[PDB]
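Sample intake — Peptidyl-prolyl cis-trans isomerase FKBP1B
Collected from: Homo sapiens
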Amino acid sequence: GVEIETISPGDGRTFPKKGQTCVVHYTGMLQNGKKFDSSRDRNKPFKFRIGKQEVIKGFEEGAAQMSLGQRAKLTCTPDVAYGATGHPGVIPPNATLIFDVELLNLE
């Protein structure tokens, strides 16, 4: 359940692959709710790789469906991220997650 709502520009040809460490300006958003996380604030744009189950499932699928310079809009189902448990005090159980994602990576 990954819905991409693309802010257009970029290249559309250089997709992320396995063995690649990539850099993402993310920004969290709760559906009918406020923010909960922001890479824009810390000024450290979250270096991470693909294929080690580092991030949640709903963020991992949308990262491969982007390219360099693109700006997407993730909409993840509750079951792929936190819906049964809920991250304690931060994410309630059975919650739908909204992300503002832009990929500006290397490799």
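Post-analysis note: The chain has one domain: 21-103.
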